[PDB]
Write an enzyme that holds these catalytic residues in place. Sequence first.
Site, PDB file in Angstrom:
ATOM      1  N   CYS A  46     -96.349  16.563  19.973  1.00 34.45           N
ATOM      2  CA  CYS A  46     -96.339  16.770  18.534  1.00 34.45           C
ATOM      3  C   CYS A  46     -95.637  18.090  18.237  1.00 34.45           C
ATOM      4  O   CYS A  46     -95.623  19.010  19.067  1.00 34.45           O
ATOM      5  CB  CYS A  46     -97.773  16.766  17.983  1.00 34.45           C
ATOM      6  SG  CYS A  46     -98.009  17.296  16.194  1.00 34.45           S
ATOM      7  N   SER A  48     -96.562  20.339  16.376  1.00 38.77           N
ATOM      8  CA  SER A  48     -97.512  21.457  16.345  1.00 38.77           C
ATOM      9  C   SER A  48     -97.685  22.098  17.717  1.00 38.77           C
ATOM     10  O   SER A  48     -97.869  23.319  17.800  1.00 38.77           O
ATOM     11  CB  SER A  48     -98.867  21.003  15.793  1.00 38.77           C
ATOM     12  OG  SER A  48     -98.733  20.623  14.446  1.00 38.77           O
ATOM     13  N   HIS A  51     -94.940  24.427  17.997  1.00 42.04           N
ATOM     14  CA  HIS A  51     -95.173  25.674  17.254  1.00 42.04           C
ATOM     15  C   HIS A  51     -95.928  26.712  18.078  1.00 42.04           C
ATOM     16  O   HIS A  51     -95.729  27.917  17.880  1.00 42.04           O
ATOM     17  CB  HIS A  51     -95.988  25.415  15.976  1.00 42.04           C
ATOM     18  CG  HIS A  51     -95.281  24.598  14.947  1.00 42.04           C
ATOM     19  ND1 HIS A  51     -93.905  24.517  14.865  1.00 42.04           N
ATOM     20  CD2 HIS A  51     -95.767  23.870  13.914  1.00 42.04           C
ATOM     21  CE1 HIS A  51     -93.574  23.760  13.833  1.00 42.04           C
ATOM     22  NE2 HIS A  51     -94.684  23.352  13.245  1.00 42.04           N
ATOM     23  N   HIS A  67    -103.025  17.979  21.840  1.00 41.81           N
ATOM     24  CA  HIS A  67    -104.113  17.653  20.923  1.00 41.81           C
ATOM     25  C   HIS A  67    -104.051  16.221  20.434  1.00 41.81           C
ATOM     26  O   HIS A  67    -104.954  15.761  19.728  1.00 41.81           O
ATOM     27  CB  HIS A  67    -104.092  18.602  19.704  1.00 41.81           C
ATOM     28  CG  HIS A  67    -102.824  18.479  18.918  1.00 41.81           C
ATOM     29  ND1 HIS A  67    -101.651  19.067  19.328  1.00 41.81           N
ATOM     30  CD2 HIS A  67    -102.523  17.777  17.799  1.00 41.81           C
ATOM     31  CE1 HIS A  67    -100.683  18.764  18.481  1.00 41.81           C
ATOM     32  NE2 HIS A  67    -101.181  17.971  17.550  1.00 41.81           N
ATOM     33  N   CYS A 174    -103.353  12.184  16.153  1.00 42.71           N
ATOM     34  CA  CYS A 174    -102.721  13.171  15.266  1.00 42.71           C
ATOM     35  C   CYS A 174    -101.680  12.569  14.322  1.00 42.71           C
ATOM     36  O   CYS A 174    -101.989  12.334  13.138  1.00 42.71           O
ATOM     37  CB  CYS A 174    -102.085  14.296  16.078  1.00 42.71           C
ATOM     38  SG  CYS A 174    -101.496  15.588  14.881  1.00 42.71           S
TER      39      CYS A 174
HETATM   40  N1  LIG Z   1    -101.350  18.878   8.344  1.00 39.58           N
HETATM   41  C1  LIG Z   1    -101.677  18.356   9.626  1.00 39.58           C
HETATM   42  O1  LIG Z   1    -102.764  18.023   9.896  1.00 39.58           O
HETATM   43  C2  LIG Z   1    -100.582  18.262  10.631  1.00 39.58           C
HETATM   44  C3  LIG Z   1     -99.301  18.949  10.428  1.00 39.58           C
HETATM   45  N2  LIG Z   1     -98.183  18.774  11.306  1.00 39.58           N
HETATM   46  C4  LIG Z   1     -96.947  19.492  11.067  1.00 39.58           C
HETATM   47  O2  LIG Z   1     -96.095  18.373  10.392  1.00 39.58           O
HETATM   48  C5  LIG Z   1     -94.815  18.747  10.515  1.00 39.58           C
HETATM   49  C6  LIG Z   1     -93.980  17.561  11.071  1.00 39.58           C
HETATM   50  O3  LIG Z   1     -94.430  17.237  12.377  1.00 39.58           O
HETATM   51  P1  LIG Z   1     -93.529  16.152  13.185  1.00 39.58           P
HETATM   52  O4  LIG Z   1     -93.294  14.944  12.395  1.00 39.58           O
HETATM   53  O5  LIG Z   1     -94.225  15.961  14.530  1.00 39.58           O
HETATM   54  O6  LIG Z   1     -92.210  17.048  13.408  1.00 39.58           O
HETATM   55  P2  LIG Z   1     -90.678  16.640  13.657  1.00 39.58           P
HETATM   56  O7  LIG Z   1     -90.003  17.886  14.172  1.00 39.58           O
HETATM   57  O8  LIG Z   1     -90.667  15.482  14.592  1.00 39.58           O
HETATM   58  O9  LIG Z   1     -90.072  16.172  12.219  1.00 39.58           O
HETATM   59  C7  LIG Z   1     -89.589  17.187  11.381  1.00 39.58           C
HETATM   60  C8  LIG Z   1     -88.388  16.611  10.617  1.00 39.58           C
HETATM   61  O10 LIG Z   1     -88.019  17.522   9.691  1.00 39.58           O
HETATM   62  C9  LIG Z   1     -86.459  17.583   9.678  1.00 39.58           C
HETATM   63  N3  LIG Z   1     -86.058  18.815   9.046  1.00 39.58           N
HETATM   64  C10 LIG Z   1     -86.056  20.033   9.627  1.00 39.58           C
HETATM   65  N4  LIG Z   1     -85.636  20.914   8.696  1.00 39.58           N
HETATM   66  C11 LIG Z   1     -85.355  20.242   7.592  1.00 39.58           C
HETATM   67  C12 LIG Z   1     -84.912  20.669   6.348  1.00 39.58           C
HETATM   68  N5  LIG Z   1     -84.560  22.000   5.933  1.00 39.58           N
HETATM   69  N6  LIG Z   1     -84.735  19.805   5.375  1.00 39.58           N
HETATM   70  C13 LIG Z   1     -85.009  18.480   5.563  1.00 39.58           C
HETATM   71  N7  LIG Z   1     -85.478  18.080   6.782  1.00 39.58           N
HETATM   72  C14 LIG Z   1     -85.649  18.968   7.779  1.00 39.58           C
HETATM   73  C15 LIG Z   1     -86.160  17.498  10.999  1.00 39.58           C
HETATM   74  O11 LIG Z   1     -84.784  17.015  11.188  1.00 39.58           O
HETATM   75  C16 LIG Z   1     -87.173  16.485  11.577  1.00 39.58           C
HETATM   76  O12 LIG Z   1     -86.715  15.163  11.645  1.00 39.58           O
HETATM   77  C17 LIG Z   1     -94.824  19.913  11.542  1.00 39.58           C
HETATM   78  O13 LIG Z   1     -94.797  21.127  10.829  1.00 39.58           O
HETATM   79  C18 LIG Z   1     -96.225  19.750  12.177  1.00 39.58           C
HETATM   80  O14 LIG Z   1     -96.612  21.043  12.745  1.00 39.58           O
HETATM   81  C19 LIG Z   1     -98.245  17.791  12.351  1.00 39.58           C
HETATM   82  C20 LIG Z   1     -99.521  17.020  12.568  1.00 39.58           C
HETATM   83  C21 LIG Z   1    -100.805  17.354  11.862  1.00 39.58           C
HETATM   84  O1  LIG Z   2    -100.961  18.890  14.607  1.00 46.97           O
HETATM   85  C1  LIG Z   2    -102.165  19.142  14.761  1.00 46.97           C
HETATM   86  N1  LIG Z   2    -102.834  20.143  14.193  1.00 46.97           N
HETATM   87  C2  LIG Z   2    -102.225  21.075  13.246  1.00 46.97           C
HETATM   88  C3  LIG Z   2    -102.973  21.050  11.924  1.00 46.97           C
HETATM   89  C4  LIG Z   2    -102.325  22.011  10.931  1.00 46.97           C
HETATM   90  C5  LIG Z   2    -102.324  23.420  11.489  1.00 46.97           C
HETATM   91  C6  LIG Z   2    -101.612  23.461  12.824  1.00 46.97           C
HETATM   92  C7  LIG Z   2    -102.228  22.482  13.826  1.00 46.97           C
HETATM   93 CO   LIG Z   3    -100.314  17.142  15.851  1.00 49.73          CO
END
Ligand SMILES: NC(=O)C1=CN([C@@H]2O[C@H](COP(=O)(O)OP(=O)(O)OC[C@H]3O[C@@H](n4cnc5c(N)ncnc54)[C@H](O)[C@@H]3O)[C@@H](O)[C@H]2O)C=CC1
Ligand SMILES: O=CNC1CCCCC1
Ligand SMILES: [Co+2]
EC number: 1.1.1.1
Lengths: 374, 374
Positions: A46, A48, A51, A67, A174
């Site tokens: 993932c 995250s 990160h 996770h 997740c």
């Molecule tokens: N709120 C929550 O509980 C969770 C939050 N997250 C966060 O969600 C976000 C996405 O996670 P994933 O889908 O796994 O990541 P990912 O990296 O696979 O997808 C991100 C997408 O955003 C695109 N992108 C990057 N910069 C861009 C921009 N300026 N404008 C438009 N598109 C852009 C990328 O090309 C990519 O396809 C991450 O920040 C992750 O840490 C992930 C899982 C749980």
């Molecule tokens: O992707 C899984 N967990 C995330 C939830 C939002 C804060 C960072 C960690």
């Molecule tokens: Co996650």
Amino acid sequence: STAGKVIKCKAAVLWEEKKPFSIEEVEVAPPKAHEVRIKMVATGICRSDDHVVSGTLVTPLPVIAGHEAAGIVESIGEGVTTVRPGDKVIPLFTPQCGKCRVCKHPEGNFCLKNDLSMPRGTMQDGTSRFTCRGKPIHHFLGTSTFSQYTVVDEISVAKIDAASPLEKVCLIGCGFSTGYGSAVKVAKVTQGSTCAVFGLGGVGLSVIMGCKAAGAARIIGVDINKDKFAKAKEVGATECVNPQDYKKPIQEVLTEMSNGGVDFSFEVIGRLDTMVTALSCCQEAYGVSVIVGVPPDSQNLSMNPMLLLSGRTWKGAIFGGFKSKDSVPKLVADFMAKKFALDPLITHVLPFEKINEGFDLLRSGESIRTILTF
Amino acid sequence: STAGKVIKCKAAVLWEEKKPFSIEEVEVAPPKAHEVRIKMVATGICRSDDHVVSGTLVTPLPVIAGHEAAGIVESIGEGVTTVRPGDKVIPLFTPQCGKCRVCKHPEGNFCLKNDLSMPRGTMQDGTSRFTCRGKPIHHFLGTSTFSQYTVVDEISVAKIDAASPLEKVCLIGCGFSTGYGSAVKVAKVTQGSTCAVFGLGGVGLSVIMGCKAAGAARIIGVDINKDKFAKAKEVGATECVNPQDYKKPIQEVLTEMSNGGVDFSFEVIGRLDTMVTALSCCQEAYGVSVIVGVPPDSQNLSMNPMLLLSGRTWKGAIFGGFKSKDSVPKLVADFMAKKFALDPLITHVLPFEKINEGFDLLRSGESIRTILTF
Ligand SMILES: NC(=O)C1=CN([C@@H]2O[C@H](COP(=O)(O)OP(=O)(O)OC[C@H]3O[C@@H](n4cnc5c(N)ncnc54)[C@H](O)[C@@H]3O)[C@@H](O)[C@H]2O)C=CC1
Ligand SMILES: O=CNC1CCCCC1
Ligand SMILES: [Co+2]
Ligand SMILES: NC(=O)C1=CN([C@@H]2O[C@H](COP(=O)(O)OP(=O)(O)OC[C@H]3O[C@@H](n4cnc5c(N)ncnc54)[C@H](O)[C@@H]3O)[C@@H](O)[C@H]2O)C=CC1
Ligand SMILES: O=CNC1CCCCC1
Ligand SMILES: [Co+2]
Ligand SMILES: [Zn+2]
Ligand SMILES: [Zn+2]
């Protein structure tokens, strides 16, 4: 033959930021009271987790990250009542203690026992079950799934259907549940509405899945990587836009496209600028915008509050708003009843020993979810 | 004997920022098609009118301000169907055209014909009906109630009960409905919840009225003017805190008082710092915060989006979320059925000629609402 004993196994240790994971022998202590030791079967990669490597998300190092996973219970500590050895389980990076004011509230899910607000990288009792090169190794979000064996607190594990395909349902731990619930539970997307999804990775594709399941009429995918558009349309996007193709700011573009703004927008990237753009592109009097992406640690955004005064709603959520222990078994049951699909998210499969290759696939932009098999 | 011809009457003209109002004779043109000319009976002094004087709220000058009022129709233009001469009316600073995408939406109220987003200070046809010393004078929010007579577009006026007490229901034209609706309709305060209300002026006291009507168990008033606390408790506050009494930031104080954050918070002042404070003091996983106060022109706030990612909802609203022409007559009818009280908001009643004294009372902190009588 391992219950009650230290297990020596392999894990991916992150010793420092911006370095590869080190696959090495660790010692995993047996579970104490109300703890569960799990043999990992599959874990997803993932953003995250990345990160943590990049320093975007600060947590104590050295650490065993991971996770998003599924496995089989190896042994349980004293007092455990919700799982047994041999049960299939999904670790929960957001716990469900069932006793705090959030767990008792009808709508919240950010349990006060979480290790995200003030990360310690430990078990609930403040100690670690991992030892490597004579040193204690921190846990991550109470899960630490980048290991052949992990130990989790009982409030951070859910028992799932014994027939579940663990190499697929790990995503319910997740990416899928976060995106899907952000649409159906947090935004409460309505039938016939217009949605904009910023970021078309694993989580953004799951948002699109939820928007389509909720009956949205238009779903506009936004990504600077046009290679993401094909899969986004497969799972429900009606249209895809690349901000780099335009001379105007994309919130103006989306506003013209939707004849005055979208009903629901979702930031699923983790950038301050796109959080403000996503809020601006929803309709000024009744639009809803949901932050899903995680921004770099301790950075503030700047925005004009008149964007809210006209009537917009801005919210965020962890894990799609799902109360984790209640919801994960139901989501698995729904998957086993073919109520949603997970295969569109899985683009690569690798053995756990190639974890670094799996992270480089994500960083290169080529993959959605790589599933690691133990 | 005034229909079809220009009326000379007195009005309070604001010729430039940061000056007293000038009470002098103006000429009021007769209403054109779909316009309504109104003889004013009572008008309240709202902080938003003072924002025009201070330059906090930018609108074209010279101007006839005033937007919280009630009066009687003098004459109607061609095509007007929803009011007749002799009807009691309340001008609507947020119109309801009934034909735009917001008016047709079940939950929006910021009609696209509004003069707030990009103020022109005119009638809908782009012209003025006011002349003073031979110079054209701008309108304000399509209302301009600081005048013995005004002309408004039909979409900016609501017919109300013929038996209405105009010197009290004028508050339904702004302050009361804005605060009350922010609680019952925008926040949707729940029974048994804990609320925090920042700012205990006319609009904030109406928020407290709404929180109490919704059955909140605790209502914490926040104001730096401790003279405001007595009236706040009268209309429902359980407790009041002055941030200047504490060494700790008030969001920390409110979080501790509410055992981890309030269910609902309201910013009803118009300061960037208290907007962020009010958001922070609501419970991180399920709290809701509503911005009601108007921020200074063209200023951005700074905030940590992790406040939203944990699960908070942040929203704003104009006029309590009420669709103006539908809701104002129902609110007057509700007032008349004794469903809520307006007298606690009225601290002073002065003749219109004492408008500057009324503003001095507001600026000094002594008044809640001063009603001007023509
Ligand atoms: N709120 C929550 O509980 C969770 C939050 N997250 C966060 O969600 C976000 C996405 O996670 P994933 O889908 O796994 O990541 P990912 O990296 O696979 O997808 C991100 C997408 O955003 C695109 N992108 C990057 N910069 C861009 C921009 N300026 N404008 C438009 N598109 C852009 C990328 O090309 C990519 O396809 C991450 O920040 C992750 O840490 C992930 C899982 C749980
Ligand atoms: O992707 C899984 N967990 C995330 C939830 C939002 C804060 C960072 C960690
Ligand atoms: Co996650
Ligand atoms: N959203 C909408 O539709 C409307 C918005 N407004 C805006 O609502 C706000 C309140 O209006 P009124 O009640 O008429 O104003 P008011 O001036 O009567 O009340 C403001 C209160 O805030 C207090 N206050 C000032 N600074 C403070 C601080 N730093 N910390 C704590 N308290 C502080 C003041 O002592 C005062 O009691 C204004 O900004 C007004 O422009 C008013 C009506 C409609
Ligand atoms: O007080 C009446 N109207 C206000 C509404 C919010 C913006 C400034 C004007
Ligand atoms: Co007002
Ligand atoms: Zn809990
Ligand atoms: Zn309209």
